[PDB]
Amino acid sequence: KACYLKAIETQPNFAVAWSNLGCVFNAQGEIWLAIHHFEKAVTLDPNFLDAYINLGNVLKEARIFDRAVAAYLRALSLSPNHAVVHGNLACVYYEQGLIDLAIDTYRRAIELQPHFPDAYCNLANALKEKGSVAEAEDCYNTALRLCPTHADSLNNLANIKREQGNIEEAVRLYRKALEVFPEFAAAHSNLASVLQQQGKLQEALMHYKEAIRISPTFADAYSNMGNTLKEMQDVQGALQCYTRAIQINPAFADAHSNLASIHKDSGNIPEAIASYRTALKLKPDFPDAYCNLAHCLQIVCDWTDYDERMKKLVSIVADQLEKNRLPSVHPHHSMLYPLSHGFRKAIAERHGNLCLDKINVLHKPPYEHPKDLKLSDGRLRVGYVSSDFGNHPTSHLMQSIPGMHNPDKFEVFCYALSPDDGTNFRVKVMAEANHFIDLSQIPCNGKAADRIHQDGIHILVNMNGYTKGARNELFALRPAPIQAMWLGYPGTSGALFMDYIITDQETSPAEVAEQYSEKLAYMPHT
Amino acid sequence: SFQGLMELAHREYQAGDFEAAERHCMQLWRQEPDNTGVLLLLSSIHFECRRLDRSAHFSTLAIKQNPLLAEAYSNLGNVYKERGQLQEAIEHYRHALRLKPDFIDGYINLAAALVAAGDMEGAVQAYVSALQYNPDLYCVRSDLGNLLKALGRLEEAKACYLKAIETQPNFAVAWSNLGCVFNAQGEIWLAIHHFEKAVTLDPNFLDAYINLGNVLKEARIFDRAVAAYLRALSLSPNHAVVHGNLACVYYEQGLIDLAIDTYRRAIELQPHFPDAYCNLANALKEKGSVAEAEDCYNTALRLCPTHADSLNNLANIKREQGNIEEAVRLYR
Amino acid sequence: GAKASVVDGTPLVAAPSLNATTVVTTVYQEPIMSQ
Amino acid sequence: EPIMSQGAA
């Protein structure tokens, strides 16, 4: 730099030395000095193209967009026909917002120089963010063909194919990205996301952990890792993780929503309401958080804005119903609102097919269970499943029945889906149990389902339903012929994997069976 | 404390408080009416706490016991400075720096008195004599710089700034003042660099943030200006001018509703402020809610009959209503 | 007696281009052209 | 700036 300056003072009218000095300063980091120098250079000559290149480059480096646009256009006028400047200019365009012009200028750049993966990748990004997917994967394929190692393109294409659900393919692509780029953070994030979708968590948790290590400020990974970390079972370490994500950037409303959800799980309703209310006011339209807040408010009976709350929640649930994926309102909350029986039927169907899509990953074949009781020797196998075996209303309501069945003609199998707690309810069930099979030891749904299948059971009865503590995925497989709701929350799950509801003449008369999904079962009085 | 050099009142002066120190010096001057610098401490306390004529009286006592101490004259001149008799302060500053020709702080006080009076060059000699006495008082060098800039002799004022800068690189104020110099000359990017350097060396130098955001919106680098202004607001929440600049940036960004909101905040902060009135009414009219645009314009025009921009806008509105005689008069 | 669900986005990626931005002057290779 | 003099004298 000293030699540069000596030349500068030797001939002040000189130009090249100014630009080179500016390069030196840009290398050191004192960017504003560099901008000054480059402006001085172009002032001393409006023809020193590479100076314009450097000036526009460092301008977009510091996000001073419009001046960069002007400099790049001057460069183009001075030389119309090379790609790199077009790529930088178009990137500036896109980050400005003029997405269509970005598409156009990427197209110009690509046609100028063919063998150019980065314009491919960015152009496909802009296309996908514009909605025209059908060529996004095409451009990504062109790029990946040009360079197998271009990790960014791998991540984007795998993201698309995740949208299409080819999770085996997407996972392979993510693995490729990682082995290619062993410090790629977003790739870890997406891989952990799909692994969470894959239900297996230890590796997903580990991937989230490494992604956080490689990128400290990745609050999204906090949010997601907390999501998992409570998803297998609550550790309010997930809560403090949510708080971490909060404080790293308070604009992230989703973390507020999640922590408020955790609070309401704990039962500390007021400040959970406060956090929901916050998160909603941060982003005016956030459906699921708003409906959850409505549920919490109705818990504390705040009937302010009552009718309009009802009508807006009806609106948003209807909207999620004809766009037809996951309803905001939980099915249990649903019927405590004035929603159409068709609406709640649809919501139950949606949660059920969500269960079916979850079990579709393991994808087990059906079973040759039915058609005879000869092997059962006259005692058909009835199996009750419950996460509420113990200290819970159900046991406080059904503890008697099982053990005092008829041992002559039936055989009963309890299934404590929840882990035990040693309460005398469980012991009384244990003695009452003709057969008892704890299932807290089989976290994987398929293994438990096989355990059931050649438990040889025929008729299954569920206690939990769409309630907290329900691995209902079991009945989504339908290991046994006939599966029935009973003594559970009112309302059919409406997903065809089960068989029957239990009712009386008058609670579910024939004219209201239409509001349910499946058939009925009537009994003398109740 | 007791039966010793009870400089504890000096310790409280370092704390800046008076009560225990004040009674302590009372008790001193009825136990050791021997030193008088303690009475100078008293006069000083009365000075900062605005106990003016008591400062004067104790200074006059200092004048009894040793009229040879220039510093009683210094304090008397300070008193005169905040009570008008600046010329007498100046001749006292003569007297003092005749008594102690190599005294610095007298130079500073008399330079302040001079710049109050209006003779620059005498103050120049004050500062320069200070410097030839001490080449390390970088703060007075920056004061030099401010005075010289006020005299528009830019380049050597900038040179003094730089000399201070290299004298103490960790210094902060000099950086901002240098940036002001560059902004005056026109090499804006150098100024932006300097102001960023200043705020980097201290995240508390509010006026630096003001200057930085100001020159940023000067060159239409909006978002950085927004960030700087918000930092300034966090550092000081409650004055209007910054709010007006921030809101103007908002409006020219496009966030017209936020511009309306922030103009409202600015106006409520400082009432007598025509420009926020005019700009707010512009934003309203461009938002369509006319019915209060003329109201705000009227408020501004009431505040200042001469505010031409408001006249033009209101006449434009009333042209829309067709009162062409009125609009023509307003244009005239 | 129930639990809710939380949405997670699918992040995009980006790609920069060259930024070195230097220049040189004497590219010729010159004779003396003397005598 | 008053002195607030500290001196043995």
Residue numbers in the entry:
A (entry chain B): 177 to 702
B (entry chain A): 20 to 351
C (entry chain D): 406 to 440
D (entry chain C): 435 to 443
What does the paper say about this structure?
A single pair of enzymes, the O-GlcNAc transferase (OGT) and O-GlcNAcase (OGA), catalyzes the addition and removal of O-GlcNAc on over 3,000 proteins in the human proteome. OGT contains an N-terminal tetratricopeptide repeat (TPR) domain required for substrate recognition and a C-terminal glycosyltransferase family B domain (GTD) that catalyzes the modification of protein substrates with uridine diphosphate GlcNAc (UDP-GlcNAc) as the sugar donor. Here, we present the cryo-electron microscopy (cryo-EM) structures of human OGT and the OGT-OGA complex. Conversely, OGT disrupts the functional dimerization of OGA and occludes its active site, resulting in the blocking of access by other substrates. This mutual inhibition between OGT and OGA may limit the futile O-GlcNAcylation cycles and help to maintain O-GlcNAc homeostasis.
We then determined the cryo-EM structure of the OGT-OGA complex with an overall resolution of 3.92 Å. OGT in the OGT–OGA complex has a scissor-like dimeric architecture similar to that of OGT alone. In the complex, the distance between the two active sites in the dimer (located at the handles of the scissor) is shorter compared to OGT alone: from ~90 Å in OGT alone to ~80 Å in the OGT-OGA complex. In contrast to the apo OGT dimer that has no bound nucleotides, the OGT GTD domain in the OGT–OGA complex has a bound UDP in its active site. In the cryo-EM map, only the N-terminal GHD of OGA and two segments of the intrinsically disordered region (IDR) following this domain were observed and could be modeled in the complex. A long segment of the OGA IDR (residues 394–442) occupies the active site of the catalytic GTD and the entire lumen of the TPR domain of OGT. The strong electron density connecting the hydroxyl group of S405 and GlcNAc suggests that OGA S405 is glycosylated. Indeed, the catalytic deficient mutant OGA D175N, but not its S405A mutant, was modified by OGT in vitro, indicating that OGA S405 can be O-GlcNAcylated by OGT. Thus, our cryo-EM structure likely captures the post-catalytic OGT-OGA complex, in which the GlcNAc moiety is attached to the hydroxyl group of S405. Instead of the domain-swapped dimer, OGA in the OGT–OGA complex is monomeric. Therefore, the binding of OGT to OGA disrupts OGA dimerization and shields the active site and substrate-binding cleft of OGA.
